[PDB]
Design a protein around this nucleic acid. Sequence first.
RNA 1: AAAUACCACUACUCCUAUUGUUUUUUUACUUAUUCAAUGUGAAGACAUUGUCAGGUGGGGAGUUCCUUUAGUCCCUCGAAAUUUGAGGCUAGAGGAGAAAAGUUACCACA
Lengths: 76, 88, 63, 177
Amino acid sequence: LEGQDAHNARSDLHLDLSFFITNLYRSLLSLSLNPDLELGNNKINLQTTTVLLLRCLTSVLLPPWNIRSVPPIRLA
Amino acid sequence: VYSEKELGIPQLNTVTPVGVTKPKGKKKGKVFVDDRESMNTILAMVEAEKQGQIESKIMRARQLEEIREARRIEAEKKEAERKALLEN
Amino acid sequence: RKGNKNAKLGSSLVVLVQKLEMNAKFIEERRAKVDFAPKDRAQVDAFLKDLEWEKTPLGAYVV
Amino acid sequence: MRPLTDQEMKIVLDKLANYMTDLKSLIAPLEDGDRYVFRMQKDRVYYVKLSIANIATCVARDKLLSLGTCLGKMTKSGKFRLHITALPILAQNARYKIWVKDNGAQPFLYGSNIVKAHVGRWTEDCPEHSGCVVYNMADIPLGFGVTARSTAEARRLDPTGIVCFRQADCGEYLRDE
RNA sequence: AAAUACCACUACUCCUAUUGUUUUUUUACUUAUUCAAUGUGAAGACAUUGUCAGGUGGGGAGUUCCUUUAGUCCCUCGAAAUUUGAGGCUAGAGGAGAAAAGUUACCACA
């Protein structure tokens, strides 16, 4: 969804990431108590789960597009 | 143009069944929707016609599947209530 | 309890978690009335020096 | 007081989905094993807690005047209409929302239609006749309505041109005083 | 309002002690009780459950009470003491039935 064409397609294509946002929100606590966070040019294939978590959180809270449109409730 | 409800037009049996119709000017028994599952199925249908047209076949299938699952859970809960009130 | 059958560990952990929840609640009521602006933190720096490790429900539990 | 029937629930949820995105959020269970339910007193629908409805059951029907939040009224012909009392729930779950300046917020509070001369922020990709909750520049829930044109048409529209049609504003609290 | 000298009574409020009764809260333990099994284990005096008095009942089944007025100053409850309030009685006036119905010098459209 952070690809440009998908971003412009968003409304027409009905591409909603609410499921992924909610899943990350519900899994934060389990990942926090997970003991294997640091047991580890690519943009997806990253070997460390904490690196993956920062990529997810950066995409959610600080998206490249519409950075000044993020819901304050989500941010808080 | 005048409404089919205003005009005394009889109901006609088609592929969509008329069912057991109710006599005119009499007590149409009120069935109440206060269950969380019944609200879920009505809500799922409402959101279906609100969203409408989807290009993705899998997305359309998932919309239909969530409506089907809502109906399945409603039927299960109603049958369970029937059993509960028939035995105990 | 959907494992093992170790009811001893089960009861020990259930009482542990109950006391942890009670202590968290206790902190809720005594912290609900503390001002913590980011340029004024006198109350939080003077929060609970005057209470000893046996008054808390978890203190009673541990002792 | 009584629960809503199937047709009544369908109509109420049709209006509510016309103005909102998520409705399972409204009917979802809470932490204490409680949920929000729908009730009807006289010709008005009330969005209420189940616990509150059950505890208010003891009040006589002719002496119960309000309960929870008044969501609207079912008309004589069987049509549901929302209210400025129902504005808050639309605020938590608004689909389309339009911001106005102070010089347009005061007219809207007087009961006028929103104009692009009053608008100061838009919602991108808004269909012609959709559901838009009207805010001021301080994100204060001010009202709700249906917009008259799409975003592109409103942008290319005359500065003195109707963009949204008013249905409810916060000035009705000065009606019922 | 009440006036103090004199000397008599009981009426509350706050404390103490033992020569005693109950009720409530917290905590502890199993015998009340709850759950699992078959040819004994866990929780716990809390839940659950039951009986009466009631409130609501647009849902299910069956059939076709309050308010005002005038009166005897006739009775009960509540209040204040040197008088009231609410009920009670006599007989006028208000409130086929959850499908919908009636109504408006009002609004919009036609």
